[PDB]
Amino acid sequence: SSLDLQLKNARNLAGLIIHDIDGYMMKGDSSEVDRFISAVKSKNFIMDLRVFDEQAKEVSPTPSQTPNAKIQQAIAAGRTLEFKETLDGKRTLSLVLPFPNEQRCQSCHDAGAAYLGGLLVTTSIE
* Binding-site residue set for heme b: 25, 109
Q: Which is nearer to ligand HEM, 13 or 26 (CB)?
A: 26
Which of ligand HEM, its own copies, none binds 41 (CB below 5-8 Å, type-dependent)?
A: its own copies
Strand partners, 87: 90
> Under a CB-based contact definition with an 8 Å cutoff, are residues 72 and 56 in contact?
yes
Q: How many CB atoms lie within 10 A of CB 53?
A: 18
86 DSSP 8-state letter: E
Instruction: Mark the binding-site residues, compressed into ranges.
Output: 25, 109
Cα separations (Å) of 70 from 6, 56, 77, 95, 102?
30, 8, 11, 9, 22
Least distance CB 76 / ligand HEM (angstroms): 14
Q: Which residues contact 55 (CB under 8 A, 6 or more apart)?
A: 67
Q: Which is nearer to ligand HEM, 40 or 105 (CB)?
A: 105
Query: Helix, strand or coil for residue 63?
Result: coil
Which of its own copies, ligand HEM, none binds 43 (CB below 5-8 Å, type-dependent)?
A: its own copies
Instruction: Restricting to residues 16-75, name those near its own copies by CB under 8 A.
Output: 16-30, 33-34, 37-38, 40-41, 43, 45-51, 59-61
Which residues form the interface with its own copies (CB under 8 A)? 1-3, 5-14, 16-30, 33-34, 37-38, 40-41, 43, 45-51, 59-61, 80, 82, 93, 95, 97, 99, 102, 104-105, 108, 116, 119, 121, 123, 125
